[PDB]
Motif scaffolding. Structure first.
Motif, PDB file in Angstrom:
ATOM      1  N   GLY H 223       0.798  -1.209   0.000  1.00 38.74           N
ATOM      2  CA  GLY H 223       0.000   0.000   0.000  1.00 38.74           C
ATOM      3  C   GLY H 223       0.834   1.264   0.000  1.00 38.74           C
ATOM      4  N   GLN H 224       1.733   1.381   0.971  1.00 37.10           N
ATOM      5  CA  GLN H 224       2.588   2.550   1.103  1.00 37.10           C
ATOM      6  C   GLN H 224       3.824   2.387   0.220  1.00 37.10           C
ATOM      7  OE1 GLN H 224       0.861   1.070   3.474  1.00 37.10           O
ATOM      8  NE2 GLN H 224       0.518   2.373   5.269  1.00 37.10           N
ATOM      9  N   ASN H 225       4.807   3.258   0.412  1.00 39.11           N
ATOM     10  CA  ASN H 225       6.062   3.226  -0.317  1.00 39.11           C
ATOM     11  C   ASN H 225       7.192   2.831   0.632  1.00 39.11           C
ATOM     12  OD1 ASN H 225       4.617   4.022  -2.561  1.00 39.11           O
ATOM     13  ND2 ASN H 225       5.208   6.182  -2.408  1.00 39.11           N
ATOM     14  N   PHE H 226       8.423   2.893   0.129  1.00 39.31           N
ATOM     15  CA  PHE H 226       9.588   2.654   0.969  1.00 39.31           C
ATOM     16  C   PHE H 226       9.618   3.662   2.110  1.00 39.31           C
ATOM     17  CE2 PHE H 226      13.964   3.459   2.180  1.00 39.31           C
ATOM     18  CZ  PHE H 226      14.480   2.193   2.351  1.00 39.31           C
ATOM     19  N   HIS H 227       9.770   3.162   3.333  1.00 37.87           N
ATOM     20  CA  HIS H 227       9.760   3.995   4.528  1.00 37.87           C
ATOM     21  C   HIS H 227      10.932   3.612   5.416  1.00 37.87           C
ATOM     22  CE1 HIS H 227       8.068   4.985   8.721  1.00 37.87           C
ATOM     23  NE2 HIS H 227       8.470   6.120   8.178  1.00 37.87           N
ATOM     24  N   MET H 228      11.637   4.616   5.931  1.00 36.98           N
ATOM     25  CA  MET H 228      12.765   4.410   6.828  1.00 36.98           C
ATOM     26  C   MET H 228      12.419   4.983   8.195  1.00 36.98           C
ATOM     27  SD  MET H 228      16.754   5.546   6.416  1.00 36.98           S
ATOM     28  CE  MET H 228      17.023   4.518   4.976  1.00 36.98           C
ATOM     29  N   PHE H 229      12.619   4.181   9.236  1.00 37.99           N
ATOM     30  CA  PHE H 229      12.233   4.576  10.582  1.00 37.99           C
ATOM     31  C   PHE H 229      13.085   5.739  11.079  1.00 37.99           C
ATOM     32  CE2 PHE H 229       9.466   1.230  12.655  1.00 37.99           C
ATOM     33  CZ  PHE H 229       9.025   0.713  11.456  1.00 37.99           C
ATOM     34  N   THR H 230      12.467   6.600  11.882  1.00 39.63           N
ATOM     35  CA  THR H 230      13.141   7.739  12.481  1.00 39.63           C
ATOM     36  C   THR H 230      13.552   7.404  13.912  1.00 39.63           C
ATOM     37  OG1 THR H 230      10.987   8.680  13.065  1.00 39.63           O
ATOM     38  CG2 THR H 230      12.003   9.420  11.010  1.00 39.63           C
ATOM     39  N   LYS H 231      14.164   8.385  14.581  1.00 37.38           N
ATOM     40  CA  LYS H 231      14.649   8.165  15.941  1.00 37.38           C
ATOM     41  C   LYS H 231      13.504   7.872  16.903  1.00 37.38           C
ATOM     42  CE  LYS H 231      17.360  10.509  18.398  1.00 37.38           C
ATOM     43  NZ  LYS H 231      18.048   9.462  19.203  1.00 37.38           N
ATOM     44  N   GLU H 232      12.407   8.626  16.800  1.00 38.14           N
ATOM     45  CA  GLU H 232      11.282   8.422  17.708  1.00 38.14           C
ATOM     46  C   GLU H 232      10.652   7.049  17.512  1.00 38.14           C
ATOM     47  OE1 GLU H 232      11.603  11.269  15.932  1.00 38.14           O
ATOM     48  OE2 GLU H 232      12.020  12.733  17.513  1.00 38.14           O
ATOM     49  N   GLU H 233      10.441   6.647  16.256  1.00 45.43           N
ATOM     50  CA  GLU H 233       9.869   5.331  15.985  1.00 45.43           C
ATOM     51  C   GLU H 233      10.804   4.221  16.443  1.00 45.43           C
ATOM     52  OE1 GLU H 233       9.446   6.456  11.610  1.00 45.43           O
ATOM     53  OE2 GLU H 233       7.398   5.827  12.084  1.00 45.43           O
ATOM     54  N   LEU H 234      12.109   4.389  16.219  1.00 40.09           N
ATOM     55  CA  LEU H 234      13.069   3.386  16.664  1.00 40.09           C
ATOM     56  C   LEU H 234      13.056   3.247  18.180  1.00 40.09           C
ATOM     57  CD1 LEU H 234      16.113   3.936  14.281  1.00 40.09           C
ATOM     58  CD2 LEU H 234      14.864   1.799  14.639  1.00 40.09           C
ATOM     59  N   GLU H 235      13.007   4.371  18.901  1.00 34.50           N
ATOM     60  CA  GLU H 235      12.943   4.312  20.358  1.00 34.50           C
ATOM     61  C   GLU H 235      11.649   3.660  20.827  1.00 34.50           C
ATOM     62  OE1 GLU H 235      13.502   8.262  21.773  1.00 34.50           O
ATOM     63  OE2 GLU H 235      15.666   8.281  21.406  1.00 34.50           O
ATOM     64  N   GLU H 236      10.529   3.984  20.176  1.00 33.60           N
ATOM     65  CA  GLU H 236       9.252   3.391  20.559  1.00 33.60           C
ATOM     66  C   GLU H 236       9.260   1.881  20.354  1.00 33.60           C
ATOM     67  N   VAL H 237       9.844   1.416  19.249  1.00 36.72           N
ATOM     68  CA  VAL H 237       9.898  -0.021  18.996  1.00 36.72           C
ATOM     69  C   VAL H 237      10.862  -0.705  19.961  1.00 36.72           C
ATOM     70  CG1 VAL H 237      10.457  -1.781  17.295  1.00 36.72           C
ATOM     71  CG2 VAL H 237       9.198   0.253  16.601  1.00 36.72           C
ATOM     72  N   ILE H 238      12.011  -0.081  20.227  1.00 37.30           N
ATOM     73  CA  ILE H 238      13.023  -0.704  21.076  1.00 37.30           C
ATOM     74  C   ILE H 238      12.542  -0.791  22.519  1.00 37.30           C
ATOM     75  CG2 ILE H 238      15.254  -0.212  22.150  1.00 37.30           C
ATOM     76  CD1 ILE H 238      16.298   0.495  19.373  1.00 37.30           C
ATOM     77  N   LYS H 239      11.815   0.226  22.990  1.00 36.27           N
ATOM     78  CA  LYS H 239      11.343   0.224  24.372  1.00 36.27           C
ATOM     79  C   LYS H 239      10.398  -0.936  24.660  1.00 36.27           C
ATOM     80  CE  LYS H 239       7.018   2.832  24.622  1.00 36.27           C
ATOM     81  NZ  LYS H 239       6.398   1.483  24.522  1.00 36.27           N
ATOM     82  N   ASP H 240       9.815  -1.547  23.625  1.00 41.95           N
ATOM     83  CA  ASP H 240       8.985  -2.729  23.833  1.00 41.95           C
ATOM     84  C   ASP H 240       9.811  -3.891  24.371  1.00 41.95           C
ATOM     85  OD1 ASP H 240       7.166  -1.036  22.737  1.00 41.95           O
ATOM     86  OD2 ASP H 240       6.722  -2.254  20.965  1.00 41.95           O
ATOM     87  N   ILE H 241      11.040  -4.041  23.884  1.00 39.67           N
ATOM     88  CA  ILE H 241      11.932  -5.102  24.335  1.00 39.67           C
ATOM     89  C   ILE H 241      12.243  -4.941  25.818  1.00 39.67           C
ATOM     90  CG2 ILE H 241      14.303  -5.929  24.222  1.00 39.67           C
ATOM     91  CD1 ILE H 241      14.132  -5.510  21.159  1.00 39.67           C
TER      92      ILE H 241
END
Lengths: 239, 113, 52, 228, 118, 236, 236, 241, 235, 240
Positions: H223-241
């Motif tokens: 549906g979408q296009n190529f997307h590269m994660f930003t610092k905020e998204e990376l921190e949000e995903v990592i904090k799940d671990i």
């Protein structure tokens, strides 16, 4: 001891009258997995074996489609296999697109041999390091052909190439007297039984390491893989 | 349609000929002193890079005159540019004279480029 | 008198020999170096006594 | 007494050029003398047997109306160089609409010779040339080595026993020497260390004047030998 | 002009087409386009290991575009005669054709022949 | 054309070592001129007083050079320099700067150490000239393609002793043509018994807005060596 | 031969070129808030040589500077190519070049020479500093293999590892507060490998909206004396 | 009965007595000096994660690009020598843009694959000029895109040919990463699960600490296009671990 | 590596050993040829050997017809000699096409020598191990005899020989030429020289004879009956 | 010839080229083949070894049909022989196209021999490693037989033999009177010679391949019928 000076180039004759680079190139065919090919009065069958590693890391294309009546199986160097496949596809497509008629298998094999003989005589080049099994159907019936890195080709009733294919060759020689009268099911069963001889005494054929290609009368070349080989695998007996 | 233009100039002690073929948002330029074609490159303006994306199609990879000239022309004109620079002079300032002559011809006849 | 005539009169070997000789002699060739005189090439081509 | 596989000799020179010079030094003698008005070139044309035909090949060759040369070394290399020299002279005449000066021709031939000392897959020429000319009422005489290094001389010799010939020329040279005396001196230098009987058929003589360059007919050579 | 060129347009199989031919001393440049732009770029050269050097075989290489056997077949059957009649000279072909068929190739060969510069 | 495991060029090293066995050349820069001094290794009485291995070539009316190496390579390089200078003059209606000419030759020299399969030129140069940008200048070159400006330098055989003596007896901003000639004669005598017929001297200067290049005569060289002998006798 | 891989996956010629680079003189670059400083130490000084022709710091354009360490002829070739590229870009696109643009061009040129058997790698490393149009200081490094990066401070040549450790220990946002502090930091970093003091230091600075400037020996000595005096004041 | 020296690894056209190409094997071995990259393709998209190692605090992390965008629907991840991949990336971008500009469609992932693979096999060509590439590229790639055939993932090595795959890891810790992937991957998993598993494996194999500054992450969706994660998204995903 | 394994490397004494080895390769055939020039004729005589009884003797020869008025005899390697003959025919045709008249013998010999010289200065190709002797008649000079060699040296002769026993043949011919010829005397002299040098009494089927004459300027190969008649006249 | 045997552009100190000699020695490790010219035709005979039972009958043929009227028998490397056969076919087709009549065997042999010799002069290629013979028949030309070896020398023969045991085969052939015989006896003689010169212990079982071209075939190269082959084999076995 005395072979050091004469085994580095393909344009150097040994004092014994030999060229060692051609033999070294022919030694590269046994670096791939085994393949089995056999024919009957009306059908030609190719059976191949996939690498024992997991399928996640790589998908292997062992059996390729060349034309509506020609298919090949490869064992050796991937780049050489790709080059030869492209050459054969271009030849068949040119023949059809121009003269509106299929290309004979013998003519195609002769062209392949003529093309592959060239790099064995020029300086700064190396022989192809791939082996081929060719199955086709034309006005003369089914055909099985074998190609060698030494630019030699043979006409076969049944043949096996690859790693540890001697047992498959022995089985094919032993059971070759009844291939002509067999139908498709028994022919595929014989091919699978021959291919099974190259495995250890405990392993068995599985839907995830077997590929099948079939051509014949009133049937274009078709490749069966994954769950498509279940009807052929069913009915096989214990080793 | 397709238009053809041809001009020449004398630089240092040589006569240099220029051939231009114009297409729909495309350009092909050939520069040389003898009728030979041994170099070719193409450049296009892309939004994934700050420098226009370019590649070499024919010739030696140690010569960067065609690539740079195509990149600069594509940046200036916002078109797809093919450049074939075949001059074989070791002096590095001769290409500056060639580029200046090309530019001068560009403002001279803007409709042919 | 050209390559086609030579092939039709003598055979396939003569033009092949001529081209191999030309290629072997022409190995002295480089772009970023100074100007060169092709003495052996002119001798083999037969134009070492005429001006173009 | 020594064989080397390197590029530069321990004395600081190219090894292959030294070997080519050694090849040159084993050839037939040649003599060149510059007089007040004109230059004389001479060489030894001794043949192995009477079966040969002296009127077939010549060692003294003219390049143009006012330039000639002689060699000492390998015949085929001299033959291949003569044609290139003639072609260069004709090209210069066509371009500049004037006869080529001797110095320019020597420079171009030397450049061609030097080209073969740097490339790979080839070998240097094994000849040394003596070139004579006439420009602006002033004679010239040049000598070139296999490597392409040329100098202007007044009297010189190469080939076999060239040191004795050079000593003879040094002892018997004069600043106001005439053409006839120069020819006599050149013939005497050739006669020195000839190991045989000199006739009018086993030597070659060429002269250059304000009228051009020409090779002497054997009758004239016999007449000159009669005086000695 | 150091380089000689000719151009001419027609309608082939109901679609307009433009043909341009330009001659060099080492290559022949043939442009056959139906979009007004250069599409696939193909290079055809005589083989260097041909036994019959008077009439050598041609090697086809794609420099820019999609690599398919049909492209090679079309390019060879389209410019083999141009390569042969020019003195065994290399050909640089830029072709952009909507659909490929033998009738279209035979129709385009005449248009190419009309613009001969070799 | 191949890097040594320690990062050195064996061909360039061999060429420099071979040049280290050639003749000795000298260059001294003064306040009002610049001079070159060379050594005549070979000499014969039968030479034709022209093209007699005259080691001081003339490139333009403003520049001159000296060579220590292979004579044929020197001829090729000098001819190329002459064409480069003439082409620049024709293009720009102005004489070429000396540094620009040296750089143009050094680029050609350097290309041979990187490209192809040909051996590099085994020749070292010494340039003297005058231009309106910087005045009197003196440069040097080597087969690798390096170059630099100097005030007094020497190349060839026994060059280290000549350089040491030059640096010991050279004073900046206080030397003229006569003192430079005397120092050059002393250095050449020390580094070579010297005879007045075994040396060549050339000088460059300005005469009413015109560069003048001259070669010293045998009588002048004899006078200079006699003056040096008188001075060394008076010293002891 | 060229383009041959080691059994562990290395190109021999690139490693040998890096070994050649390791023998060059040390160069240090530091990026400040509104100034960039480059400093190169002098391996040896000859009193008979002109210092203008042996400089290791060059200006590619009005806003780009460069320092190198390695072979000199290759560096000269690279500098000339970069200058021509900058001039051509200015003439055609009528815009000034950027530090990243010129760094990418130089890196691509270096990488193109590791591909074929007919060429050999260059064998130099470069430090590139300057200011962009928006006024942002930049600092980049290149190596013979074609790799480039962005740094806050870096060193190349001999003692590069020691100078890098010193810069890592001593580089803080409070040490680049002013131009004098930045210059003192560069001088202190360069003095870690030079034993003769400030007499073997070559320094150059560039400021926003200003051209390249070269500091005089008097200024260098004054800065060295100030640094020393601060050293004994700290030591008490 | 004498032991003598014999070598077969001097040129690219020499076979060993057992039929091997040692120069190509060494070029392949050169990839072991790079960082670890992971690529997973599911029925909903392709996820790419790479590790960037910073060798000094003075270096700028933003100057390291190991994930690039070929087009709006194709992404790539590198491992090895970044300077070698520039030509391949430029060729792929030029091919895709030219095809769009000419025909107004988008190339297939297989077509871009073939175009790239034509250039990587320049060594060993029949009539390749000596001025072109003469050695194998010392870099490995991981192509991921969405086409009308669905999400696809391809792998290339210095050998010069591409092979399709489902979950592949390249780099120095490739063995351990693949061993971890074997017991995690299954056909019914989703994009978020793929991202979490890739991050877990990267944290397991990395010597440093995962802190959302030394890694990169990107995804491609139909549906979408190529997307590269930003610092905020990376921190949000990592904090799940 | 070595001064004798390279064609483009001089020895310390200034010699090219590959050319000398090519000269040595001529004797591998084991035959001898003799050419003698007369007042108005030229004669070439070679030695024929057919040892095998299963070999068709009609296919063994060493006399060739380059042009309708030019003959040739080759000594050395058979394949090299045939290749050389083909090249000579091609060069003659090219000269005729370019200049509008038939090539002279000396010009053909010079062209062949010029071609042979190139092989000695390049390392990628080797010289041919054969020797060529050409005969013909000039419009304003009469009979002509020319000879080539692998080194690229050519000259005109009154009498010459090639192959084994060349020194003995030259020594025999020197005395006869010094002492001092009709058509019958030239053939008799050549046959006598060959017979005395080889110490063999000849048979009509053991030699080949080719002649050219001013009256009939076309190259002709003698028949066995004519050779037998000449032998009977000599004996 | 140590030190002078790594290239075909090098001369030995005694004036020899050793690469060509090695190429000619490379023919001696192949099965022998013979050919006998008769009063009204030529007969070929090849001793063919069997590799495996998985190959179809009629594969790996060593008796080719160059054209409608030319037969060919090869020995040595198979790929080189196939390439040479293609070259011969191309030459014959070109001559037919240009001059309008069938090419004489002499010209074809000369052209192929020159093509073979062209590969023995340069260091960029290697000499061929095969030998072959050509046979033909015509009403106005009779029977013809030729041989070409790797050096590039061609000659006409009355009886020829190539391969591993050519010396014994030639000695056996020398005892024949083929100038007055017919093909129907030459076939049996060829079979007997092939059976005689075969080694039973060193080499495994073999099969016999026979062919002729002659008057009774009207200038065509064909395969011997099965009954004649069986009779010839029986005669050879009972004689041996």
């Amino acid at each position: 001891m005395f072979r050091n000076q004469y085994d580095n180039d393909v344009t150097v004759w040994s004092p014994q009258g030999r060229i060692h680079q051609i033999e070294y190139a022919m030694e590269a065919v046994k670096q791939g997995s085994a393949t089995v090919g056999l024919k009957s009065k009306t059908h030609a069958v190719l059976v191949a074996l996939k690498r024992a590693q997991s399928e996640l890391a790589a998908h292997q294309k062992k059996i390729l489609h060349v034309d509506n009546h020609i298919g090949i199986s490869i064992a050796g160097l991937t780049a050489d296999a790709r080059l030869l496949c492209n050459f054969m596809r271009q030849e068949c497509l040119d023949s059809r697109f121009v003269f509106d008629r299929p290309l004979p298998v013998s003519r195609l094999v002769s062209l392949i041999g003529s093309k592959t003989q060239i790099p064995t005589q020029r300086y700064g080049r190396r022989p192809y390091g791939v082996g081929l099994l060719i199955a086709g159907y034309d006005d003369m019936g089914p055909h099985i052909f074998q190609t060698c890195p030494s630019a030699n080709y043979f006409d076969c009733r049944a043949m096996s190439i690859g790693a540890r294919s001697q047992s498959a060759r022995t089985y094919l020689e032993r059971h070759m007297s009844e291939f002509m009268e067999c139908n498709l099911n028994e022919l595929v069963k014989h091919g699978l039984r021959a291919l099974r001889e190259t495995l250890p005494a405990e392993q068995d054929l599985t839907t995830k390491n077997v590929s099948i290609g079939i051509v014949g009368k009133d049937l274009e070349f078709t490749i069966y893989d994954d769950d498509d080989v279940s009807p052929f695998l069913e009915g096989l007996e214990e080793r | 349609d397709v238009s053809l233009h041809n001009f020449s100039a004398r630089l240092w002690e040589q006569l240099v000929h220029f051939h231009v073929m114009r297409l729909t948002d495309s350009l092909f330029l050939w520069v040389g002193a003898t009728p030979h074609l041994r170099n070719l490159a193409v450049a296009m303006c892309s939004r994934y890079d700050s420098i226009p994306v370019s590649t070499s199609l024919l010739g030696d990879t140690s010569d960067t005159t065609s690539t740079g000239l195509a990149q600069r022309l594509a940046r200036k004109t916002n078109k797809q540019v093919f450049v074939s620079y075949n001059l074989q002079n070791t002096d590095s300032n001769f290409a500056l004279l060639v580029e200046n002559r090309i530019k001068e011809e560009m403002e001279a006849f803007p409709e042919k480029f | 008198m050209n390559f086609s005539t030579l092939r039709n009169i003598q055979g396939l070997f003569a033009p092949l020999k001529l081209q191999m000789e030309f290629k072997a002699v022409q190995q002295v060739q480089r772009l970023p170096f100074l100007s060169s005189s092709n003495l052996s090439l002119d001798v083999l081509r037969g134009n070492d006594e005429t001006i173009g | 007494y020594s064989f080397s596989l390197t590029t530069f000799s321990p004395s600081g020179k190219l090894v292959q050029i030294e070997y080519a010079l050694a090849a040159v030094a084993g050839g037939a003698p040649s003599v060149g003398i510059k007089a007040a008005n004109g230059v004389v070139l001479a060489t030894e044309k001794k043949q192995k047997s009477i079966l040969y035909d002296e009127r077939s090949v010549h060692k003294v060759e003219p390049i143009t109306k006012h330039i000639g040369l002689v060699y000492s070394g390998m015949g085929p290399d001299y033959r291949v160089l003569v044609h290139r020299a003639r072609k260069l002279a004709q090209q210069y005449y066509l371009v500049y609409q004037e006869p080529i000066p001797t110095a320019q021709l020597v420079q171009r031939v030397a450049s061609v010779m030097q080209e073969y000392t740097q490339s790979g897959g080839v070998r240097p020429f094994g000849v040394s040339l003596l070139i004579c000319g006439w420009n602006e009422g002033r004679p010239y005489l040049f000598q070139s080595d296999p490597s392409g290094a040329y100098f202007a001389w007044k009297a010189t010799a190469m080939g076999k026993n060239y040191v004795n010939g050079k000593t003879f020329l040094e002892k018997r040279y004069n600043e106001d020497l005439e053409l006839e005396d120069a020819i006599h001196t050149a013939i005497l230098t050739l006669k020195e260390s000839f190991e045989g009987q000199m006739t009018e058929d086993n030597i070659e003589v060429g002269i250059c004047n304000e009228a051009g360059f020409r090779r002497l007919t054997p009758t004239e050579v016999k007449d000159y030998l009669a005086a000695i | 002009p150091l380089v000689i060129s000719k151009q001419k347009t027609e309608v082939v199989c109901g679609v307009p087409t433009q043909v341009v031919c330009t001659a060099f001393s080492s290559h022949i440049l043939v442009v056959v386009t139906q979009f007004g732009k250069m599409g696939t770029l193909v290079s055809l050269e005589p083989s260097s290991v041909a036994s019959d050097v008077s009439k050598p075989v041609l090697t086809t290489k794609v420099l820019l575009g999609q690599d398919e056997p049909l492209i090679h077949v079309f390019a060879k059957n389209l410019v083999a005669f141009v390569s042969q009649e020019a003195g065994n000279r290399a050909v640089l072909l830029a072709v952009a054709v909507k659909d490929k068929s033998m009738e279209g190739l035979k129709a385009l060969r005449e248009v190419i022949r009309v613009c001969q510069v070799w | 054309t191949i890097f040594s495991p320690e990062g050195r060029l064996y061909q360039v090293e061999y060429a420099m070592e071979a040049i280290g066995h050639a003749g000795t050349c000298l260059g001294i820069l003064a306040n009002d001129g610049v001079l070159l001094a060379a050594e005549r290794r070979n000499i014969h009485k039968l030479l034709d007083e022209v093209f007699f291995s005259e080691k001081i070539y003339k490139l333009n009316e403003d520049m001159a050079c000296s060579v220590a190496g292979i004579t044929s390579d020197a001829n090729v390089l000098t001819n190329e320099l002459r064409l480069i200078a003439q082409r620049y003059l024709l293009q720009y209606q102005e004489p070429i700067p000396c540094e620009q000419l040296v750089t143009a030759l050094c680029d050609i020299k350097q290309a041979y150490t990187q490209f192809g399969g040909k051996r590099p030129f085994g020749v070292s140069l010494l340039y003297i000239g005058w231009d309106k940008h910087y005045g009197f200048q003196l440069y040097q070159s080597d087969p690798s393609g390096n170059y630099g400006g100097w005030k007094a330098t020497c190349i060839g055989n026994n060059s280290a002793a000549a350089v040491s003596m030059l640096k010991q007896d050279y004073k900046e901003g206080e030397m003229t043509l006569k003192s430079a000639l005397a120092l050059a004669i002393k250095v050449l005598n020390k580094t070579m018994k010297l005879s007045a017929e075994k040396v060549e001297i050339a000088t460059l200067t300005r005469e009413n807005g015109k560069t003048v290049i001259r070669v010293l005569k045998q009588k002048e060289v004899e006078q200079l060596i006699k003056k040096h002998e008188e001075e060394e006798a008076k010293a002891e | 031969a060229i383009t041959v891989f080691s059994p562990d996956g290395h190109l021999f010629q690139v490693e040998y070129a890096q070994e050649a680079v390791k023998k060059g003189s040390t160069a240090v670059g530091v990026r400040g808030r509104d100034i960039v400083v480059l400093g190169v130490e002098k391996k040896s000084v000859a009193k008979l040589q002109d210092e203008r022709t042996v400089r290791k710091i060059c200006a590619l354009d009005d806003n780009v500077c460069m320092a190198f360490a390695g072979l000199t002829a290759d560096a000269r070739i690279v500098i000339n190519r970069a200058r021509v590229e900058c001039q051509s870009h200015r003439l055609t696109v009528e815009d000034p070049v950027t530090v990243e643009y010129i760094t990418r061009y130089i890196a691509s040129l270096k990488q193109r020479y590791t591909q074929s058997n007919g060429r050999r790698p260059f064998g130099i490393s470069a430090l590139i500093v300057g200011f962009d149009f928006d006024g942002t200081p930049r600092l980049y490094q290149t190596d013979p293999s074609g790799t480039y990066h962005a740094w806050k401070a870096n060193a190349i040549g001999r003692g590069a590892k020691s100078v890098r450790e010193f810069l890592e220990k001593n580089y803080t946002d409070e040490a680049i507060e002013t131009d004098d502090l930045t210059i003192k930091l560069v001088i202190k970093a360069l003095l870690e490998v030079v034993q003769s003091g400030g007499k073997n230091i070559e320094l150059a600075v560039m400021r926003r909206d200003q051209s390249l400037k070269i500091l005089n020996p008097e200024e260098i000595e004054k800065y060295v004396a100030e640094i020393e005096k601060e050293k004994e004041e700290n030591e008490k | 009965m004498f032991l003598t020296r014999s070598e077969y690894d001097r040129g690219v056209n020499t076979f060993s007595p057992e039929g091997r190409l040692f120069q190509v094997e060494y070029a392949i071995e050169a990839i072991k000096l790079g960082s670890t990259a992971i690529g997973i393709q599911t029925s909903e998209g392709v996820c790419l994660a790479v590790e960037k190692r910073i060798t000094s605090p003075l270096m700028e992390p933003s100057s390291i690009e190991k994930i690039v965008e070929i087009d709006a629907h194709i992404g790539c991840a590198m491992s090895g020598l970044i300077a070698d991949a520039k030509t391949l990336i430029d060729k792929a971008r030029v091919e895709t843009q030219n095809h769009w500009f000419t025909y107004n469609e988008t190339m297939t992932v297989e077509s871009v694959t073939q175009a790239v693979s034509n250039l990587a096999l320049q060594f060993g060509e029949e009539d390749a000029d000596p001025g072109a590439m003469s050695r194998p590229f010392g870099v490995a790639l991981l192509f991921g895109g969405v086409d009308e055939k669905g999400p696809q993932l391809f792998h290339m090595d210095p050998s010069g040919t591409f092979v399709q795959c489902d979950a592949r890891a390249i780099g120095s810790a490739s063995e351990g990463a693949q061993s971890s992937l074997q017991e995690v991957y299954h056909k019914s998993m989703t994009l978020k699960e793929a991202i979490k598993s890739s991050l877990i494996i990267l944290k397991q194999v990395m010597e440093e600490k995962l802190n959302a500054t030394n890694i990169e992450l990107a995804t491609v969706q139909p549906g979408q296009n190529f997307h590269m994660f930003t610092k905020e998204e990376l921190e949000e995903v990592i904090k799940d671990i | 590596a070595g001064f004798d394994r390279h064609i483009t490397i001089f020895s310390p004494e200034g010699r090219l050993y590959q050319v000398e080895y090519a000269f040595k390769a001529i004797n591998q055939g084991g035959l001898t040829s003799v050419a003698v020039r007369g007042k108005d004729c030229a004669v070439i005589v070679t030695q024929k050997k057919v040892p095998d009884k299963l070999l068709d003797s009609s296919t063994v020869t060493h006399l060739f017809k380059i042009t309708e008025n030019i003959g040739c005899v080759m000594t050395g390697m058979t394949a090299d000699s045939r290749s050389q003959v083909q090249r000579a025919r091609y060069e003659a045709a090219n000269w005729k096409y370019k200049y509008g008249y038939e090539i002279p013998v000396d010009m053909l010999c010079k062209r062949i020598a010029d071609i042979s010289q190139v092989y000695t200065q390049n390392a990628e190709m080797r010289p041919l191990g054969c020797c060529m002797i050409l005969i013909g008649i000039d419009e304003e000079q009469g009979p002509q005899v020319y000879k080539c060699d692998p080194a690229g040296y050519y000259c005109g002769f009154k009498a010459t020989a090639a192959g084994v026993k060349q020194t003995e043949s030259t020594s025999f011919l020197e005395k006869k030429v010094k002492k001092k010829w009709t058509f019958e005397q030239t053939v008799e002299t050549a046959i006598t020289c060959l017979s005395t040098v080889l110490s063999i009494d000849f048979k009509p089927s053991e030699i080949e004879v080719g002649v050219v004459t001013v009256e009939n300027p076309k190259f002709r190969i003698l028949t066995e009956a004519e050779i037998d008649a000449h032998l009977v006249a000599l004996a | 010839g140590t030190g002078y045997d790594l290239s075909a552009s090098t001369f030995s100190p005694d004036g020899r080229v050793f690469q060509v000699e090695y190429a000619m020695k490379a023919v001696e490790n192949s099965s022998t083949a013979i050919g006998i010219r008769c009063k009204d035709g030529v007969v070929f005979g090849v001793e063919k070894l069997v590799l495996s039972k998985l190959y179809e009958e009629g594969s790996n043929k060593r008796l080719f049909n160059v054209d409608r009227h030319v037969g060919m028998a090869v020995a040595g490397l198979l790929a080189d022989a196939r390439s040479l056969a293609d070259i011969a076919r191309e030459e014959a087709s070109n001559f037919r196209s240009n001059f309008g009549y069938n090419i004489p065997l002499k010209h074809l042999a000369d052209r192929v021999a020159m093509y073979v010799h062209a590969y023995t002069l340069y260091s960029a290629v290697r000499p061929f490693g095969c030998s072959f013979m050509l046979g033909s028949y015509s009403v106005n030309d009779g029977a013809q037989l030729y041989m070409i070896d790797p050096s590039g020398v061609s000659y006409g023969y009355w009886g020829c033999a190539i391969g591993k045991a050519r010396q014994a085969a030639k000695t056996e052939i020398e005892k024949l009177q083929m100038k007055e015989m017919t093909c129907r006896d030459i076939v049996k003689e060829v079979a007997k010679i092939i059976y005689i010169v075969h080694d039973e212990v060193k080499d495994k079982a073999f099969e016999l391949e026979l062919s002729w071209v002659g008057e009774l075939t009207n200038g065509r190269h064909e395969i011997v019928p099965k009954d004649i082959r069986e009779e010839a084999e029986k005669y050879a076995k009972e004689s041996l």
